[PDB]
Design a protein around this ligand. Structure first.
Ligand SMILES: NC(=O)c1ccc[n+]([C@@H]2O[C@H](COP(=O)([O-])OP(=O)(O)OC[C@H]3O[C@@H](n4cnc5c(N)ncnc54)[C@H](O)[C@@H]3O)[C@@H](O)[C@H]2O)c1
Ligand SMILES: NC(=O)c1ccc[n+]([C@@H]2O[C@H](COP(=O)([O-])OP(=O)(O)OC[C@H]3O[C@@H](n4cnc5c(N)ncnc54)[C@H](O)[C@@H]3O)[C@@H](O)[C@H]2O)c1
Lengths: 315, 315
C-alpha cells in the first residue's frame, strides 16, 4: 500500500514511519520541519520505499502533489502545543484547521481511499463522564487547540461522506517517549538540566491525565488501522489512551527520582482553579473499551510509561 | 444593551433585528448583501439606535470595526441556504469557518461578553436517534455544509473558554417565513409561477424535516438568550425546531393548494437513496425538550408553518 504521513518527521509521525517502513508499506513523508527533524527518519533516506518532501501544507500545490498516487493518508501534521492558545491562536488555527482543510481539498478525487487522523482527548474539553466514551457529548473543547482538533474532525467527516473515502479518527491521550520535544516530561527534564535545585511546575500539580508510551501508541494505531481496513464504517471514532491516569505532581516526582535530584517544587498556582494555563483540562481519562475490542491493550500503565520515557530521555 | 447582528440583512437576521429594535436594544448590522437585502432592514435607517455596516466578514478590519462598543454578537452570517448541495467546499469553508474565525479574533480584543450562534441540524448528520438530542454523538456530519457548521461551533467553544466570553449555540431546524428566498417553498412557488402544470421535485419526496416559522424561531432565540443571560454556563447548546415534521411531497401539496393549482409532480428520485442532493439528510427532527424548559414552545406545527409561509410569500 502507498501511504502519505503528514508530519512524519515529528515525534509520533517518525515512530509511525518506522513501523510502516518495517512492514513494507511505500511511505511518503510530508513535513515542513517547523518542529520535526529529518534526524527522526534519517535511516530511511535513500530507501526505495521511502520519499521525503519538505513542504508547508499551507501551500495547496504541495499538498495536491503529496497525495498523488497514495492509497492512505496518515495526517499527523499539526502544532500540538495547547499552552500557546491564549497568545498565538492563529498558529493553532492554521496548523490544525487550515492545513487539514487543504489536505481534504487535495484528497478529493485523488484516489486516496483512507484518511487516518490523530485527534486529541482535548476535543472533549472538561469531559463530565469519566472514563470518557467516544459518544460523549456535547463536545465542548476549552482550548483553541482542542477546538481546532474538533473542527478538523468535523471537516474530515463531511469530506469523507461527500467525496467517498473512509476516515479513521483516533483521539489520543497524552503520548510520551523518545523523540518527544513537547509536554510536561520534556519540560521537567530540561528545566532540571538547567537548574537541578528548583522545579517550576505550572498549575497546582493536581491535573490528572492518561499517558501512553509511544510504543503502545503505534501498536494501537496499527491495530485500529488494520481493523478499520477490514470494516464497513465510513467514519470511525476511537479513543486511544491508558487504563489509568497520573498527576502532574507525581510526574515531577518520577522525573526527580530518575535524575537523582531533590528539587524544590515551585507550583505556580495556575488559573481557573489550578490549571497550568488557559484551556488546560484538569481531568482526562478516555474509555478504551472500543479500542480493546480489536485486541489492542497497553503494555505499560501511565506510571510505567512515564518512568520508561524518563529513562529513555536520560540515556 | 448594544448588539451586533452579522447577516442582519438576511432572512432570519432581519427579523431578529426587528425584534431587538422593538425591545430597545441598540442594534448594529454587519452584512455584505451577498444574499440579504437592504429592503429587509431599511425601515430602521434614521433610527438613532440603528447602524448598518455593509462589509464582508472576510475583511478583518471591518469585523474589528463592527465589534467595537458592542456587548453581544448574534452571528447569523453564513453561506446562503439556497441550493446548498451545489455550493463548493471553498465557499462553505470561507462563509462558515473563516468568517467565524475572523469574528472570534475580533471578539477577543473587544468588550463582547456574549456570542449567539445559529448552527444547524446538519451538524448531526444522519442521526440514528430521532428526535435528536443535543448530546447525540459521535457527531458525523455528511455534508461539507454540516461539517463547516460543526467546525464553527468548535472554534466558538474554544475561544469562549480561552478568552473569557460566553457562547450560546442554537442548532436550527428548517426555518421558513416572509423574506426567505431559500428553500423548498420559495422554489416551489417560483416553479409553479413559471409553469402551473408541473412541479419538478428534487429527490423522492419522502425527506421528512422539522419546520419552524420565523415568528416562533425569533421567539425561541430571544427566550434562550434571556435564559442564557441569567445563567452561568460558559457555553450552552440548544436545539430549536418543531415538535413534528413534514415531507417534501406534503409541502408541495400545501403549496399547490394555497396557489389554487393542480400540477403534476415529477420526482427526480435524487441521489444516495432519494436525497435531493449529495449530503442532504433524509430524516431530521430535533428534540426541543431542553428549549421547552425555558418556557418556549412552537405555536405552529410544521404544517401550519408551511401554510403561513406560503400565504406570506404570496402577499
Ligand atoms: N504528542 C501528544 O501527546 C499528542 C496527543 C494527542 C494528539 N497528538 C496529535 O498527534 C500528532 C503528532 O503530534 P506530535 O506530538 O508528534 O507533534 P510534533 O510537533 O512532534 O509532530 C508534528 C509534525 O507536524 C509538522 N508540521 C507542523 N505544521 C506543519 C505544516 N504546516 N505543514 C507540514 N508539516 C507541518 C511538524 O514539523 C512536526 O514534525 C498531531 O496531530 C497532534 O496533534 C499528539
Ligand atoms: N434558514 C434556515 O432554515 C436555517 C437553518 C439552519 C441554520 N440557519 C442559519 O441561520 C443563519 C441565518 O440564515 P438565513 O436563512 O437568514 O440565511 P440568509 O442567507 O438569508 O442570511 C445570511 C446573511 O449573511 C450575509 N452574509 C453572508 N456571507 C457574509 C459575509 N462574508 N460577510 C457578511 N455578511 C455575509 C448574507 O448577505 C445574508 O444577509 C445562518 O447562520 C444559517 O446557516 C438557517
Amino acid at each position: 500500500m502507498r501511504v502519505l504521513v503528514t508530519g512524519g518527521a515529528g515525534f509520533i509521525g517518525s515512530h509511525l514511519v518506522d513501523r510502516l517502513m518495517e512492514e513494507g508499506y511505500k511511505v511518503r513523508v510530508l513535513d515542513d520541519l517547523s518542529a520535526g527533524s529529518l534526524k527522526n527518519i534519517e535511516g530511511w533516506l535513500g530507501n526505495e520505499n521511502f520519499e521525503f518532501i519538505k513542504g508547508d501544507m499551507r501551500d495547496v500545490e504541495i499538498v495536491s502533489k503529496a497525495v498523488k498516487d497514495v492509497d492512505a493518508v496518515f495526517h499527523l501534521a499539526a502544532n500540538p502545543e495547547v499552552r500557546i492558545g491564549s497568545q498565538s491562536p492563529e498558529l493553532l488555527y492554521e496548523t490544525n484547521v487550515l492545513i487539514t482543510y487543504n489536505l481534504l481539498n487535495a484528497v478529493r478525487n485523488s484516489g486516496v481511499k483512507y484518511l487516518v487522523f490523530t485527534s486529541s482527548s482535548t476535543v472533549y474539553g472538561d469531559a463530565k463522564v469519566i472514563p470518557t466514551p467516544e459518544d460523549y457529548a456535547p463536545l465542548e473543547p476549552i482550548s483553541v487547540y482542542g477546538a481546532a482538533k474538533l473542527a478538523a474532525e468535523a471537516l474530515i467527516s463531511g469530506y469523507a461522506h461527500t467525496f467517498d473515502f473512509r476516515a479513521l479518527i483516533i483521539r489520543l491521550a497524552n503520548i510520551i517517549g523518545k523523540r518527544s520535544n513537547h509536554g510536561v516530561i520534556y519540560d521537567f527534564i530540561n528545566k532540571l538540566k538547567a537548574n537541578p535545585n528548583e522545579l517550576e511546575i505550572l498549575g497546582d500539580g493536581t491535573q490528572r491525565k492518561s499517558y501512553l508510551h509511544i510504543s503502545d501508541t503505534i501498536d494501537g494505531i496499527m491495530k485500529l488501522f488494520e481493523h478499520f481496513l477490514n470494516g464497513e464504517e465510513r467514519v470511525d471514532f476511537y479513543n486511544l489512551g491508558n487504563e489509568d491516569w497520573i498527576t502532574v505532581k507525581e510526574i515531577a516526582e518520577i522525573v526527580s527520582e530518575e535524575m537523582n535530584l531533590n528539587p524544590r517544587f515551585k507550583f505556580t498556582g495556575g488559573v481557573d482553579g489550578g490549571r497550568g494555563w488557559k484551556g488546560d483540562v484538569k481531568l482526562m481519562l478516555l474509555s478504551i473499551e472500543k479500542a480493546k475490542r480489536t485486541g489492542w491493550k497497553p503494555r505499560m500503565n501511565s506510571y510505567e510509561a512515564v518512568r520508561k520515557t524518563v529513562r529513555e530521555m536520560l540515556e
